[PDB]
Amino acid sequence: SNPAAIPHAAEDIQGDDRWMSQHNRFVLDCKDKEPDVLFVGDSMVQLMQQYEIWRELFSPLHALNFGIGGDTTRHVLWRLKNGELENIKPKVIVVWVGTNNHENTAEEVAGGIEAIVQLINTRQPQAKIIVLGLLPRGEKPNPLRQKNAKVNQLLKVSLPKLANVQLLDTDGGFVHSDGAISCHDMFDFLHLTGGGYAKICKPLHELIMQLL
Amino acid sequence: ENPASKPTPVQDVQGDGRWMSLHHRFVADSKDKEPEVVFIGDSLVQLMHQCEIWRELFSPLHALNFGIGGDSTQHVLWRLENGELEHIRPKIVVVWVGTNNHGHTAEQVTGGIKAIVQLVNERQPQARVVVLGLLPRGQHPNPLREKNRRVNELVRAALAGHPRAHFLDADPGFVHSDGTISHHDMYDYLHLSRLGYTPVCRALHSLLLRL
Ligand SMILES: [Ca+2]
Fold first, then answer.
1. Distance in Å, CA B132 to ligand 1 centroid
2. Which of the residues A184, A195, A198, B84 has an alpha carbon 20 to 30 A from that of A51?
3. What is the CB neighbour count within 10 angstroms for residue A153?
């Protein structure tokens, strides 16, 4: 039984209950909003809205962003089953999660993303889903690059399957020949800078325009 | 014994060694640069440019940003004692840490901050230190708000009268009359959005010029 495929809320261990506050807000947005494009996932998704690129490329598409920093496949699943997929009928749904699934094997993470896709076209069978490939991370070669690459390969094979879904695995010149990632693409060797998002968003935006 | 003031690095528990990679970069990019202002602290410092940017109010100052998300006081202390304060001679050092010291009391965290200031005063005596107040957090009233607020009180007191250390409470009042924080100022009720940072950087800039 895949643990990454089982919905589970991110329990508050700090005390400021920020996770639920974000979730509730997304539920609140689902009430007085009607988007055509829905963005769901982790910090890779959330942080995208904090860059100018979002207003120029995605704001015009009437898009909602339900990204939460630190979320794993389990967390995303829970949110999707608990209201974040109600009162709305998006034509396109962008999913980007898995890089925070520490302790889970690549196979488990792939399985969890699949569980997400399955839940999405169950609740939103009319929506076309776009799953973003997990990006390399770490300044130098390390286990997570391998782990993340295996997830993308596994998804590439499992996603042509399932309904209305496809894997977009765009990759800039992130990992150079010397095996290093520049802080100019990822400032902390994980999250993207504006230059880094430029390499990913443009292709993502054309596929969305297409699907729509 | 105060754990908030016991120098210690962040252990890698994911496998990509990003924390050490940042530290080493901060150590290297400094032995080739001569900044006038150096920022160090947690994510609030690291992500400072996610509003307007870092040149229309900070780059002209030839500054370096050594902020790392997730750091507590003892972490910033370790980094300052292990190379980040070498090869350079800034005029001002900006400190912004404490909100992540979960498990430590306001008094312990305050001590952590005082040790950081003291460390900067010993290694970089010519610089003036600026400590930023811990910002409120959480959508609704909660223990962490009280804790952070208490830290500012204690730090303000310990820094008032300090020859070369200044406390700046750059909070414009993110907490509204109904006790809530708007996701427009803090998208996750912790990190600042682009419009949330404005008031902070604004007040920070007004002080940097005064010094
Ligand atoms: Ca942080």
1. 15
2. B84
3. 15
